[PDB]
Structures are given as structure tokens and as C-alpha cells.
Design an enzyme around this catalytic site. Structure first.
Site, PDB file in Angstrom:
ATOM      1  N   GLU A  41       0.826  -1.197   0.000  1.00  0.00           N
ATOM      2  CA  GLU A  41       0.000   0.000   0.000  1.00  0.00           C
ATOM      3  C   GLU A  41       0.866   1.255   0.000  1.00  0.00           C
ATOM      4  O   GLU A  41       1.953   1.292   0.583  1.00  0.00           O
ATOM      5  CB  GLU A  41      -0.929   0.011   1.214  1.00  0.00           C
ATOM      6  N   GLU A  63      -4.258   0.863  -2.509  1.00  0.00           N
ATOM      7  CA  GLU A  63      -5.008   0.405  -1.351  1.00  0.00           C
ATOM      8  C   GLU A  63      -5.422  -1.039  -1.584  1.00  0.00           C
ATOM      9  O   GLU A  63      -5.873  -1.394  -2.676  1.00  0.00           O
ATOM     10  CB  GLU A  63      -6.240   1.280  -1.095  1.00  0.00           C
TER      11      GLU A  63
END
Ligand SMILES: [C][C]N([C][C])C1=[C][C]=C(C2=N[N]C(=O)[C][C]2[C])[C]=C1N([O])=O
Ligand SMILES: [C][C]N([C][C])C1=[C][C]=C(C2=N[N]C(=O)[C][C]2[C])[C]=C1N([O])=O
Ligand SMILES: [Mg+2]
Ligand SMILES: [Mg+2]
Ligand SMILES: [Mn+2]
Ligand SMILES: [Mn+2]
Ligand SMILES: [Zn+2]
Ligand SMILES: [Zn+2]
Lengths: 371, 512, 512, 371
Positions: C193, C198
Site C-alpha cells: 500500500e 489500497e
């Protein structure tokens, strides 16, 4: 010895050329040739035509005789100097009329006075005449007629440095503009035959005088950046320009007269070159006077070593450029829709003239480097 | 334990924070929490110092082995600290794993709509959020300090006879409880915590340790909001328990409380300096006719000005040392508001006529530049406020849109190296552009050093761009904004004479 | 479920939020967490509306029995919400347990150094804090919106060949992973990430439910910071797991994602309106030559302007209704900046000559006032922008330092009651003083109604002060600041003619 | 016809009374009686004494003969009107000298010129002469001598309303102040015998003229609130007053001359009453002229219904009050340490006069109510 206007108030032989009063590139010099340099009735005839087009004669019940007499006296007051003569006053009056009356794309419109050359049916265009009251428009036109009255052909800096009586009288604070406004109002109040505002009440006359004086004093170039900064600050505000505010309308009128006073670079090539020739002739005369007085010759005023291209490029990039940019960003610049984009003749002419001066400067520098 | 790296090739302040463990999994699995907190504190202090000192680089030795930035990341605690310091992390921070080191490129803090002039890790000013003592954030501290500065610091009314309950009732009950000579064990209070009442329970062994730690923040909160009462010796259910202690223990505790309160920093915006008005009392607790323990009641009066639990946690870099801002400096920052163009023409002509090879070298260098501005000076170091180097013939600053600013140093000495002088000049120029200039984007300054032989031979002794690497954001700059920032910095440094070719002739004619 | 109480005697906006459980122990032991959250939301909405509407009172029925404010308190969650809304709770909030009701007196929000013009429960603007999506606070949202408004919204550079790792490496790896036609189960990713990546893991049953909930905030964060990639179907250790679904399930999920993204509010500061540029892809996961599940990859491009996860959570009171501010209004608020004296003399003389008993009544009322100013008007309701009441003879406003402002209404009608007119006029006056006037302290307006008999008999029909009770802070006002705020409010309302006795004669002589 | 000064430049009979030039309540009217109303040499003698005390004669090599000749001509220029006569000019010059030279508690001091009545040994006091250069101080003194030159006894509003030639000349923009400055500088430049600044270079003369003109124009009461607001904004700034900045020093000098121009209410009871009598006599003459011209009588200018107490109370509470408060808050107000508190005679006198006027107004209102 009152300077009364000639008995024929309206000249019919000009009726054709006045038809071209609706275009930005007005052949004013052709009008000067047609009328004649001896009589010098150009400003009076142009002002009469513009007032008839607006209808201020019937709106304010303006007497024709007094109006013509006073404007002829104003023409006589202007001196025969190369640039700041009655021709410049007529050009500035025509420019303020063009800016106020001609359609402006996207300008919303709210007594009021509209020109006879404007189409009110169309809803995609607006004019400053539809947002500025008739009294303020008349004040702006009169101030434009009075902006450079009795100009001595010398700059403020020359008068201050030489300790001229005008500089001492006004304490070196906007000597030229204060002198112009004071002389114009003294001439207006000197003779009863020049009082074309007799039908205005006491309060309206005072407000008109205040507006005219403010507009005349706005033409000073020493305070040019102050006005530009104030206008930019007002425009960039989220509130924007408020046409119901007296101060905002006064600022708009001052910006219009300032833009019209230096409209020369924004015209076509021929008019721009002629105005540049006139202003550099005036500069050369001022420099000759400085050399005679023993003071150092001011820049661009040396006839022996002309810098006309440099002067014009600097003036366009520093004075006319930012002012036109601010006026266009405010949204008051006249133009047309192209099919949606906005096309402005003034901005295009200014860009073309600036490119021409840059090319001339580059060519001169190359020629100097070769030698 | 933060030192300025003087051996770096970068033309900016590089702060070495020592070995730092990186990676989310690596940092979350660190056995020693003290070491992790210390590393986080060091990184945060370095970041705050760079933000307050014109930007720079944080260089951290990667402690953990086999660490890949792409695969592992940074660490949750470090990211949380960065988010606390900066509203928009991507606007200020860039991360780069260079070999065995981790580089955090930090942009200078710029004045924004929030009004903050500096960055603070913790203002150490506490307030009362009805029941809790919380450290004022930057905005809250700014508002509090400005409100106090503006006002030089900071009976009963007849009301209808209505049975109502307010915080004043709790304050009055706490005041009555404060004046009691003796207390009875296992009795319930008639009041609870409020803006003026705090109740805590501490063990006897940890009482002395926690007095030095948590008492300052509650005292600061009370003195900052409205004063109040702190009661130690009461359990969760508001039952009077107390702590067992002797008279000597009571005297030692009172002395420790006095020392802790007098140690707290205080700043006064008023004409009459005042101390923290506090009253400490010990109430005996009697159970079945015998003394069980004591309850400590501390009444803190409302203070006229700011009360600090500790010195404000703001840092900067001065004299190549990372120093915490003093309280006076922090208060002052918080409360007090703030083709190719060759210029100047005369200096350029003189340099080109005196040295023929210089013009050829300049033309060769600028043939690869699409559009920009080149500004010459006898010594750009002097214009930035540094010491003059007489061996350097001249300096040239190049500002272009496609490349970062480049400083060209020229020297006639073959056997001497001017790397340090050029690096220091570039560092100072970057700092002045960031802080004094007002430039709000990421900017880096490269350096190129040339030797001008008397016969006209030019050689590039040092090229900074080929030896250092930056994030791509630093390689694209806004030429107009760079020129504006340079103009502002030169004007504020009293070194603006002829760098910008303004139309003096035209302004002289107009009179401006 | 918030209604304006029209039956109250207070001269201010009273918002009834229904039954609310109060007390720390009572609220922490509430079995129904949904009810507790709903009560907290209602109280917060009422407080925000009162802050944005000139202040007022929140009246809450005490749901729990045997509740004492002094003994129990308020509640941790409510206090946390108040602290989130307001930097300094004691400056704005007062609490009073009146009988079976709880009153929260809320002062109007005042412009301060932070620059905020209104209060927002949640701006619903998200940003990327390196790995997390966080909702911009009021200051961050203000800065973001102003920066975008100022700029009308918002290739490669040659670098030395140095082996470095940046966020661009993770973004490129995620982009390559996005274009893969098929995936292999139980393979490790080469990236983690970052600001542009994400990774989340969701169960099959909860996937559809959570898409409508958490996807908007991550999409808003990506579109607000730099765009990015969201990957659903990967566990904590970055191993490809996926979720089992059919083709119909994939189509339904894609439709739900499209609907959720198109539902998100968007505000544009640019000339060319644009949609949210997103690409949704489903990658099959193959284990031992068989399809295990699917991984959802969502690429969100960088957006030109603000992207909202939901409408901004700001409230106000209009037309006696608690209404949430529309997105346009919220944006406009965020980004667009802002003895006894008897006056006027002529009106006072006319009123005293026409009615003899009025002068005696005024003298009797003012004999108890140490110092203040009394301003008479034909109808103070008109000066505040309300409808005129022709039955009222005149109105009088008394501003004194020892007492709150008092509005005196006089009428000649014996059989008619003017309580509602006077209460509405006082409410409007308080709101104008707080918002338009610029008064920054707690202010309340009392009312007194008098009947002027033709024979000169005066009777006090209604006295507001004896029937309502306020916290003591409302009973002491700053006379000079009240007069300044009243002057500013009258000037901005275009109703300032002769209320203040300025020296017109002196200014007329001078010319000002 | 040059107005040359009398052959005795220094009058010995006044040497005693000039000894009281170091106190705020200077008996100027006694000096007028001693010198004589016919000769009108008060301003020249007081200016000579102040210049000797400062030492500007030796600092700038000022010729005595030219200085005395020009100041005598300046005295002759002042008209014999009740208030704005040479006595007012002398009072304003004495007040600016007192404000600049007398010790100021807590004022830090940084060529420069110090008065002979100041103790430099003490470190607890300061003076504006120690922070303002000698050229700027001389400009301030000369401007104070020139502040109301050739005053016609009428206000700006009266001249604007009646369309007086002075109002038309200056376009209704600070008519009185512009006229005073222009006439003073025209008189200075008219005769070579009045040139006492011959030893100044060209740049210094221009800067001196600019400072004098700015200080004279600051005396206009129409812009009083603008100056007060600007000064308050500069003082309330965390930077504060910067004595190394030319603009800040100019603003300080303008504030000093503004305070000195209306120092009358700040004096003792007798001087305040005499100045009030003079100004109300001038107002009554102006009101009589207005009644003769048919214009409505301006307030406080009706001799039939005097409002002297109301006028004085309004002037003190609105004009003198805020100005004195701002000047004291800046820290430039002269005073003494009392043993630590600061005692100022000017503020105490102003408060006493304001209380006296309030008592008079209350008594008059009570008497009117009884009848
Ligand atoms: C008198 C104003 N001014 C001299 C300072 C001036 C007048 C006219 C023009 C001018 N130049 N070019 C043209 O085309 C005609 C006019 C606009 C330029 C200047 N100026 O500022 O130098
Ligand atoms: C000409 C300036 N002015 C008339 C508008 C004026 C002059 C003098 C005094 C004055 N009044 N009281 C005194 O004690 C003497 C002087 C200061 C007051 C005014 N004024 O503004 O009304
Ligand atoms: Mg002109
Ligand atoms: Mg005067
Ligand atoms: Mn002109
Ligand atoms: Mn005066
Ligand atoms: Zn203090
Ligand atoms: Zn957009």
C-alpha cells in the site's frame, strides 16, 4: 470675449463618415482632413453625434446651443501640439463611447440610456450603458472630452523637475490632470453661454462634477498601477463587480477612461503608427527643451538616438498590456461570439502590434550586432 | 541525537537521525517499544526542523536487513506522525530508498489559510474539554495565544428562583469538599468531574512518579481554561479511598508538587507578571475511628496568561545544529504576523568583454535550454548574506521551466576546489527562495563549476546534477513563480539592484 | 427528528431533539448502541444548526430516570462530539438541568483566526495519508477548497542511473498488476500500500454491503490526492485469495460499483465539467488449473476538483426547519470570504410629547439602571427585516453593562397580547447581533411589554426576565461591544438612520 | 516689492519671555502684547529662538538674513482673522517643538539634532529629536510655520459649496491645505532673498519640499480619521513604529503636526477659552457671510443661537480625544515619571477641559428644562 460656436451646429458633409462611428478603427484623421485643421470642429461634431446616438439631449433636456458653444470653446482650448491635441480628445471620446455602448459577450444588464446602434432583442450580449446610469455615462463622456485639456506638451516629471508654476501650484501632485480638470471647470463656469447643464438640480450637478473630476484625475499614469491593483483586487473578490454600488461604477468608469486614453496601441497598424509618430514628436520637442535648459535628456526623448521601437514595446508590455488584460478578465471587453469562444478585435490588434515591435527590436539588434 | 550531515553532496540541509527500522511488519514487530518511540521522535524532530528551516533531506540508516521500500513500506506510526505534523503529506514529503539509506525530502513550511508560520510537534498547551485535559492543536493554540495577546491577557446576577443544576454547583461542592478538615472512608461524593473538577486514583508507589508526569498537564489545563480542583485518592465510583502515607511522605509529596508546578513554563502577555496560584491540601481519611490514608486536593486558580506543561516542542536548524525553539521565539512565531534573458546588461557586457571564452561557454551551455533567464553577479554568495569569496570570478543563476535552478560558478584558479562554496551558496539560495522568497513548491538548486583558462579553455570541474538524484517533482519548476520568489527574496535581503530588467526608463518618464 | 420548539418562552431558537440518555455511567451502559449513536447524532446536528443559525438552546428530554447533572455528568461520547465541533467548549456551550429537561445553550459561531465561517460535522472530503483514507478536517478542507478555487481546479526528467525505490515503483507495479488477464492463487505481490495503492480483503456475503459503504470514501480519497488502485481480494500478507462469485454476481457487483460512484457528489471549480474517471476490472484467480475466485481492481484517475463521498454534513435552521446545507451553499461558505442616552432625539421628543405617561414609565424603569443607552423606534421589527405590526406604538431597546439587552414594547390595545411579536423581534435581534453584528460573546435579549392607557396608566403585562432563566454568563454584557455590534448590524441591514447620535453637525462642518 | 525683515533680527526685550519656551502653557498672548500687533514679528522671533535652541542654523549653515526675511514675509502673509492668524502659526510651531524636543518616558533613542533644554545624561527619557533626522525636523517646523498660510477664514465646506475660485482651482480636494502649501512655496521661490536653503543640495531640497508639503496637507481635518486609522494600524502591528523607515517617520511627523494644530483644548483653561473665543468668532463671521449669500447657516455658526459648549465638547470627544489617545498609546506623548507611572500635562488638561464643557452643557440643559 466668449468663444461662441459657429452658427451651423450640424455639418451635413460629415454625415457619411459619422456612419463609421460604430467601428473601433474609426478613420479620425480622414475626418480631420474633411473638416479642416483651421476650424477644428472635430470634437464638437463627434460629441454631438455621440450624444444624439445615446439620446442624452432628450434624456437630460440638454440645450443644443450651450453644448455646442462649450465644446467649441473646449476645442479652441486644446493646443496644436503633435499628440495631446483635440484629435486625441476626440479619439478618447470615441473610445469611451465604443467601450460603453458596443455589445459585450456575457455581460448581464439590470434612468438608463442605450445607444441606437445596439440590439436590445438579443440576450447573449450586454453593454455598459445598461448597467451604468445615464448621468454617470454623461460624466464619463464629458471627462473624456476634458481629460487632457490645455496640455502643455510636457510630462509631469518635466514640470516637477523644472519647478514649473503649474507644479508649484498643485504641489507636485498630479499636476497635469489637476490642471486639466481645473481649467475645464473654470471655462465651464466662466460663461453663462457654456452652461448646458442648467436643467440639472443642485445635488445632481455636484455629483456630476465629482464624477467628472474623478474620471479626469484617473487618467494620470503615475497612479496607473494603483488603479490596476485596486481593480484586480475588486474583480478577484468572490463578490465581484457590483453595479448597484456607486464606488464600483466609478471605478469601472475610471478604468474605461484609462483604457481609452492609451487605446492607440490597441488600434490597427496605420492608426497606431500615426499616434506613435505624434507621441515621439512630442517627446523629441520635450527633449530639445530639456537640452536647452541644461537638464539631462530624458530617455526616449533624444532625437539624435531614437528608441521608438523600444519605447512602444515597453509601453505595450508594461502599461497597455496589463490594463487590457485586467479589463478583459473583468469581462467588460467588447467582442463577438465565434461558433463558444469570444473574439476581441482590441486584444488581437494589441498582440499584433506587440509582435511587430518585437520583430523590429530584434531586427535592429541584429543589425547593430552585425556592425 | 540528530546531526547535520556535512559530507553530503546535496545542496541542502541533510539531517542524519541514525539507524531507523522501516517497514510496517518490521516496525509493528519491534520488541523494544522504547527504541521504536525514540526513532519516531527523532524522525519527527528532524522533519519539524527541516519544515521550520527551509526544507531539506532526512537521511536514515536502514537498521533492518533485506528491507525493500516497494515491498515493505514505511510504518504506521511514522505515517501517523507525518499526518499529525502535515495536513497534506504528498505536498511536502517524498520518500526514496537509496542503497542502504532512506531519504525523506521535506519541503519548507509555507504560510497558508490556517495562519500557521511554523510547525510544532506539540504546543504543550492544555485545555479542558469538559472532563478531559487535551493538548491544544496548532490552530487551537494559535487562536488562544492571539486572543490573549489582543486583550493583554484575560458579582452575582439576580435570576428567577428555579431549581436548576449547572457546573457551578459541582464547582461549589468541590470547593466545600476542599475545605473539609477530615474525611470519612467509603462515602460517596455529591459531585463528579466537570470543567473545574478532575478526579484521579493513583497507587502509593506510583504516586510520586506520576506527580512529576501528569500533574503539569492538568495544572496547565486548569490554569488555561477556568481553574479547578484536582482530587487524588478517589476510586472510579467516587468513593473516598485515599493513599497510605506518613507525615514525612506528605512533606516530600508536597515538595515534589511545588517543584513540578514551579518548573512549568509560563508566558505573560500582561504588564503585571504573576505566579501560578495553587493551593495543595491533604485531607485525612478516617475509617472506624482510625486514620486510613490521605486525599490530595489541589486547587488551581485561573491564570491570566498561557501556562505550559513543558516547553513547546518546536525545532529548527541554526548554526548547523538542531535546536528546539525557545518559548519566546515560539510565542513570537505564533502571535506575530508576517530566448534567454541576460541581466544585468552592464555586468553581462563587462564579463563578456573581459573574458572572451566565458561568452562561448555560456552560449554552449544555453544552446540546450528552450527558454529561461540567466542572472549574473560578481558573487551570488554576498547577495544571499554570506561571506564573499574573492577567488570566484562571477556567479550565474539559471532559471528555466524544464529544469531546476542551476548556479554557475566560474573560477580562474586551476589547483583549488570550490565545491563547498558553491554548495553552501546553493543551499542558502534554496532556503531564501523557500522562506523569504515565498516559493510554495518543491525546489532544488543544482551547481556547475567551471574553470576559465587565460587562453580561453573551459572545463566543467563539478556537475551537481550528475552526482545527486531527486524525486521527479523537484525537476520541474514554475519559471514565473521562481522569478517572483527570487525578486521578493532579493528585495527583502536588500540586495536587489539590477537583477531584473524593469523598464526604469519608462517608469522614470512616468515618474514611478 | 429535530424540530423547532414554538411553545418555548425563550427569545431564541429552541431545538427539541427528543429523549436523550445522559450521564457517563448511564450512557456507557446503554444496551442499544444504535439508539446511543442516534441520540449523539441528533444532539450534534442540533448543535451545528444552532452554531450556524445564530445560537440558541438545545432542549432534550431526560430519558433516564433519577438523573442528576451534578452527580452523573453528561457523557463521554457527547463531550467528544462537542470537542470535535468546537475548539473551546466553555466559550460556546452552557449546560443546565431544568426539571425533566436538559438545556444546552449554544453561542453563535464567530469568525476567528482559523478562517472558518461555518461549522461542519464532517466535510466528507477524503485524502490519502500515505496509506489511509482520512476525512479532511475543517482546516484541511478549507485549505483544499481555497487552493482549488484559486487555480480553477488542479513528461519524464533525466536522472542519474541510480538504483532507487519510490512510490512511483509501487504505482507502476500496481498498474502492471491491473492489466494482467489472469492471476495465480497464493502468489505474493511485489508492491504494498502507498499513496496510490489500497488493498482490502472482504468476505463474499459482506462484499455487496461494504461496496455501498466504504468504496465511496476510498474513491474520494484517490480522486482528491493523486488517483490510485484499489484491490479487493487480497489478504493481509498480500497473497492473492479473491472471492468466489458467478458471472451474474460479477455483473451485479459492477452495476453496484457504478451506481455508488455515480451517486458521489462532485463540485467543479473549472470551466469544463468532468465525470469521475474510473475503470473496474475483474481478474480470475486460477489454482491448480481451476478458477478459484475473482479479484476486483478499481483504477481511479486523478480528479480536477473536489470529490465528495457524501454530501457535506453541515446544518442550519431556515423557516423554522433544521435543514442540511446543500453542497453549493457549503462550498460558498467555505471558499468565499466575508446617565442614560435617549436616541434618536426627535423621535424621543415626539413620543414623550404625544404620550405623557410614556415618559413617566421610562423614568421609573430607568431609575434602577446605573448606566446605559435606550434607543427608540417606531417598530424595531421593521429595522430587523420582519413584518411591521401597526398596533404596537413603539419599541425601545435598552443596552446596559450590568444587564442583558431588554426590548420594551408598548401598545395601546388592552385586550390583545403581543408576546409572540416581541419574542420574535428579540430572537431576530439576537441573531442579527450574533451573526451580522459581529458580537462574539454570549448574549440574550429579554422583553418587557407595557400597555399605555389613554388616561396615562401603565401596566407591565409581560416580563420575560422573571419567566426564563439563563446561565450567569448571559446576564453580563459588554456595553461598548454591544453598541458596536448593533451599529454594524444596522448598517448592514440598511436600517441605520438616526439610532446613534453621531456628531453630524461637526462632520458636516468638517465635510466628512 | 520684497518684504524684507526689519534690520534688528533679534529683539532683546523678549529674551526673558522666551525663557518660558520650555513649558507647554506658553503665554503666547503676552508675547503678542509685548511685541506689538502692528509689527507682527512674533512668528519670526519664536522661530529664530527655536532654531537657535535646536542649532539648525549651524547644522545646515542656514543664513540668518534670508531666514528672517522669509519668516517676516510669512508673518505678513497671515491675515488678521480671529483664529487663523500668525498667533496660531506661532502656537503650532511651539507645539511641534515641544512635542519633538521635550523628554518622553520610555522612548528609546538611536545627522541628529538635540535641543539645548534636553538632558542627554538621563537614560530614562527620550525625545523625538533623537529618532528623527535634522532635515525632517526642520521640514516639520517649516511646515508648521506654513500650515495655515493665507487662510481666508472659511472652511473647506464653505468654499466648496459657494464654488469659490480656490475650490475650482484644486477641484474640491483639500482646498485650504493645497492653497497654503502652494502659496508658501510660491513665496519662498519668488524672491532670492527668501532662499535660506541655498546650502542644501538638489536631492535634499526636493526631499525637504516633499516632507513640508506632506506635513502641510496632513493638517486637513477631512482626512483626519484616515490618518488616525492608519496610525492605529501601524502602532497595533507587532513590528510597531520603525524609526529607520522613511514612511514611518513621515507618518510620525504628520501626526505631530496634526496634534499641534488642534492643541488648543489640550492647554490650560485661559488659553483654551481664548482660542475657543477666537474660533467661534471666526465661525460667526462665516455664518454671517453664509446668511448674506442666502445659503443655510451652518451649525455652530449662528451668532443668534450660540452652541459654543456643544461645539467644544464634540470637538474634544471626537477629534482631539481620539487623536491624543492614539498619540499617547503610541508612546510619543511627553510626560514625567512619578514615584512607576507616567504623568502627562496634556492629557490631564484635555480631561479637565472636557469635564468643564460637560458641566457647562449639563447646566445649560438644566436651565433650559426649568424654563
Ligand atoms: C503624457 C503621457 N505619456 C508620456 C509619459 C504617454 C503618452 C502617450 C503614449 C503613447 N504611446 N504610443 C502610442 O501608440 C500613442 C500613445 C498611447 C505613451 C506615453 N508614455 O507613457 O510614454
Ligand atoms: C478650520 C478648522 N476647523 C473648522 C472646521 C476648526 C478650527 C479650530 C477649532 C478649535 N476649536 N477649539 C479650540 O479650542 C481652538 C481650535 C483647536 C475647531 C475646528 N473645528 O473643526 O470645528
Ligand atoms: Mg493625460
Ligand atoms: Mg488648517
Ligand atoms: Mn490623455
Ligand atoms: Mn491649522
Ligand atoms: Zn499574565
Ligand atoms: Zn473540475
Amino acid at each position: 470675449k466668449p468663444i461662441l460656436a459657429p452658427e451651423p451646429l450640424v455639418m451635413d458633409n460629415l454625415d457619411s463618415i459619422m456612419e463609421q462611428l460604430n467601428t473601433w478603427n474609426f478613420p479620425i484623421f480622414d475626418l480631420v482632413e474633411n473638416i479642416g485643421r483651421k476650424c477644428g470642429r472635430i470634437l464638437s461634431q463627434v460629441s454631438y453625434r455621440l450624444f444624439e446616438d445615446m439620446g442624452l439631449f432628450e434624456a437630460f433636456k440638454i440645450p443644443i446651443r450651450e453644448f455646442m458653444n462649450y465644446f467649441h470653446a473646449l476645442e479652441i482650448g486644446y493646443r496644436d501640439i503633435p499628440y495631446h491635441n483635440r484629435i486625441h480628445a476626440t479619439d478618447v471620446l470615441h473610445a469611451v463611447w465604443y467601450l460603453t455602448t458596443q455589445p459585450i459577450p456575457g455581460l448581464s444588464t439590470v434612468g438608463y440610456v442605450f445607444s441606437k446602434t445596439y440590439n436590445v432583442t438579443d440576450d447573449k450580449y450586454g453593454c455598459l450603458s445598461g448597467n451604468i446610469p445615464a448621468l454617470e455615462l454623461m460624466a464619463l463622456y464629458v471627462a473624456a472630452a476634458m481629460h487632457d485639456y490645455d496640455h502643455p506638451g510636457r510630462t509631469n516629471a518635466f514640470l516637477v523637475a523644472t519647478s514649473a508654476p503649474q507644479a508649484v501650484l498643485y504641489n507636485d501632485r498630479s499636476v497635469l490632470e489637476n490642471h486639466h480638470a481645473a481649467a475645464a471647470w473654470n471655462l465651464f463656469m466662466s460663461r453663462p453661454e457654456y452652461n448646458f447643464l442648467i436643467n440639472l438640480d443642485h445635488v445632481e450637478f455636484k455629483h456630476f462634477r465629482f464624477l467628472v473630476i474623478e474620471a479626469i484625475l484617473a487618467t494620470d499614469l503615475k497612479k496607473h498601477f494603483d488603479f490596476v491593483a485596486k481593480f484586480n483586487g475588486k474583480v478577484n473578490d468572490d463578490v465581484g463587480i457590483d453595479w448597484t454600488n456607486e464606488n464600483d461604477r466609478l471605478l469601472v468608469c475610471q478604468m474605461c477612461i484609462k483604457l481609452a486614453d492609451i487605446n492607440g496601441p490597441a488600434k490597427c497598424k496605420e492608426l497606431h503608427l500615426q499616434w506613435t509618430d505624434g507621441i515621439v514628436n512630442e517627446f523629441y520637442e520635450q527633449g530639445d527643451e530639456e537640452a536647452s535648459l541644461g537638464l539631462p535628456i530624458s530617455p526616449f526623448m533624444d532625437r539624435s538616438a531614437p528608441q521608438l521601437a523600444n519605447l512602444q514595446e515597453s509601453f505595450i508590455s508594461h502599461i497597455v498590456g496589463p490594463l487590457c488584460n485586467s479589463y478583459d478578465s473583468a469581462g467588460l471587453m467588447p467582442g463577438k461570439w465565434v461558433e463558444r469562444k469570444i473574439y476581441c478585435q482590441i486584444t488581437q490588434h494589441l498582440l499584433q502590434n506587440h509582435k511587430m515591435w518585437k520583430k523590429v527590436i530584434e531586427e535592429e539588434q541584429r543589425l547593430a550586432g552585425i556592425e | 541525537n540528530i546531526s547535520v550531515d556535512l559530507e553530503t553532496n546535496y545542496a541542502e540541509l541533510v539531517l542524519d537521525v541514525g539507524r531507523v527500522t522501516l517497514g510496517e511488519n518490521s516496525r509493528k514487530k519491534m520488541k523494544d517499544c522504547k527504541l521504536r518511540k525514540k526513532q519516531n521522535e527523532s524522525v519527527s524532530r528532524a522533519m519539524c526542523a527541516l519544515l521550520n528551516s527551509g526544507g531539506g533531506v532526512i537521511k536514515a540508516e536502514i537498521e533492518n536487513e533485506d528491507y525493500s521500500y516497494t515491498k515493505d513500506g514505511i510504518g504506521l506510526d511514522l505515517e501517523n506522525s507525518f499526518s499529525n505534523i502535515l495536513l497534506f503529506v504528498p505536498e511536502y514529503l517524498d520518500f526514496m530508498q537509496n542503497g542502504n539509506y532512506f531519504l525523506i525530502f521535506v519541503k519548507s513550511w509555507s504560510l497558508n489559510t490556517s495562519g500557521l508560520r511554523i510547525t510544532t510537534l506539540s504546543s504543550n498547551l492544555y485545555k479542558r474539554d469538559i472532563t478531559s485535559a487535551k493538548v491544544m492543536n496548532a490552530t487551537a493554540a494559535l487562536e488562544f495565544l492571539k486572543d490573549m495577546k489582543k486583550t493583554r491577557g484575560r458579582l452575582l446576577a439576580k435570576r428567577p428562583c428555579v431549581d436548576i443544576q449547572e457546573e457551578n454547583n459541582m464547582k461549589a461542592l468541590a470547593g466545600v469538599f476542599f475545605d473539609r478538615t477530615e474525611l470519612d472512608r467509603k462515602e460517596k461524593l455529591t459531585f463528579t468531574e466537570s470543567t473545574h473538577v478532575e478526579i484521579k486514583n493513583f497507587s502509593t508507589e506510583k504516586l510520586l512518579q506520576r506527580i512529576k508526569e501528569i500533574l503539569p498537564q492538568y495544572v496547565s489545563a486548569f490554569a488555561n481554561t477556568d481553574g479547578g480542583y484536582l482530587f487524588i485518592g478517589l476510586n472510579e465510583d467516587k468513593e473516598i479511598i485515599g493513599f497510605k502515607a506518613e507525615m514525612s511522605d506528605l512533606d516530600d509529596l508536597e515538595r515534589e508538587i511545588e517543584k513540578s508546578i514551579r518548573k512549568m513554563p509560563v508566558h505573560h502577555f500582561c504588564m503585571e507578571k504573576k505566579k501560578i496560584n495553587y493551593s495543595c491540601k491533604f485531607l485525612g481519611v478516617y475509617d472506624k475511628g482510625s486514620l486510613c490514608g490521605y486525599v490530595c486536593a489541589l486547587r488551581v486558580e485561573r491564570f491570566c496568561c498561557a501556562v505550559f506543561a513543558k516547553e513547546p516542542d518546536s525545532w529548527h536548524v541554526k548554526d548547523n545544529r538542531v535546536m528546539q525553539l525557545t518559548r519566546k521565539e515560539w510565542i513570537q512565531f505564533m502571535v506575530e504576523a508576517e530566448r534567454i534573458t541576460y541581466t544585468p546588461e552592464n555586468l553581462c557586457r563587462k564579463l563578456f568583454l573581459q573574458h572572451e571564452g566565458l561568452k562561448q561557454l555560456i552560449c554552449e551551455e544555453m544552446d540546450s535550454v528552450r527558454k529561461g533567464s540567466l542572472i549574473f553577479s560578481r558573487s551570488w554568495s554576498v547577495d544571499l548574506g554570506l561571506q564573499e569569496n574573492h577567488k570566484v570570478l562571477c556567479d550565474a543563476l539559471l532559471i528555466s521551466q524544464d529544469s531546476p535552478p542551476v548556479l554557475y560558478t566560474f573560477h580562474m584558479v586551476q589547483d583549488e576546489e570550490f565545491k563547498g562554496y558553491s554548495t553552501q551558496t546553493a543551499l542558502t539560495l534554496k532556503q531564501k527562495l523557500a522562506k523569504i522568497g515565498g516559493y510554495t513548491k518543491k525546489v532544488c538548486v543544482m551547481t556547475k563549476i567551471f574553470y576559465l583558462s587565460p587562453e580561453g579553455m573551459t572545463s566543467c570541474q563539478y556537475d551537481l546534477r550528475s552526482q545527486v538524484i531527486y524525486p521527479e517533482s523537484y525537476y520541474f519548476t514554475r519559471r514565473k513563480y521562481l522569478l517572483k520568489a527570487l525578486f521578493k527574496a532579493l528585495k527583502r535581503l536588500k540586495s536587489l539592484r539590477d537583477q531584473f530588467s524593469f523598464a526604469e526608463n519608462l517608469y522614470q518618464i512616468i515618474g514611478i
